[PDB]
């Protein structure tokens, strides 16, 4: 095979799925008895075997490739709001860059794993890290997956074309970023800012 994006999409796919899954544990989108802690990217990260979720991310990952990789994927935002009665409280936003000028394609294997390990290391850690930094939390919140494209993005009932909603009042804190000639992944999470009045 003479693929190109598939390579980056491979890491980017497992990267998002790993970083995302970890988010749910770090956040509390479902019972902890459903996830498994593993050592991927050379470091320890947790994962989940949730079928429903796996089915949610399956469609996302499947189309992420078809709909996103076939239209350029640049950034990703995640809106997490307490379903019980807390509105938007946590919003996990990560940047995704697929293919960064490489018309050559004359280099055996074009994918950075080491630099990846570092990012993914901080990505899995930053999620879990901030949580510990938070004063306890675990609400049956709802999920909102956001995707950032470039050209005209055509969506039916699957997604909602927008994004600027930028929550109502939350602070965004940078955690880490990485840019390679084959792809670039950024990491920054935001949560509801206290002191409303």
């Amino acid at each position: 095979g003479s693929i190109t994006l598939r390579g980056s999409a491979e890491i980017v796919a497992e990267f998002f799925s790993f970083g995302i899954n970890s988010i749910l544990y770090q956040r509390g989108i479902y019972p902890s008895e459903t996830f498994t802690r593993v050592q991927k990217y050379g470091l320890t990260l947790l994962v989940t075997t949730d079928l429903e979720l796996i089915k949610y991310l399956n469609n996302v990952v499947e189309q992420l490739k078809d709909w996103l990789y076939k239209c350029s994927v640049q950034k990703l935002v995640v809106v997490i709001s307490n379903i019980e009665s807390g509105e938007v409280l946590e919003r996990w936003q990560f940047d995704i860059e697929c293919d960064k000028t490489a018309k050559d394609d004359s280099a055996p294997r074009e994918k950075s794993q080491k630099a990846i390990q570092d990012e993914i290391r901080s990505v899995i850690r930053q999620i879990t890290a901030t949580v510990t930094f938070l004063p306890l939390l675990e609400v049956s919140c709802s999920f909102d997956l956001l995707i950032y494209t470039d050209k005209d993005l055509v969506v039916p009932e699957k997604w909602e074309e927008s994004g600027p909603q930028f929550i109502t009042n939350s602070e965004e804190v940078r955690l880490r970023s990485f840019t390679t000639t084959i792809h670039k992944v950024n990491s920054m999470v935001a949560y509801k800012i206290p002191v409303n009045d």
Binding site: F143, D144, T149, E161, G163, Q165
Partner: peptide, 10 residues
């Protein structure tokens, strides 16, 4: 142009 993905239901 970014997307918005809705959550589950029940």
């Amino acid at each position: 142009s970014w997307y918005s993905y809705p959550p589950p239901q029940r």
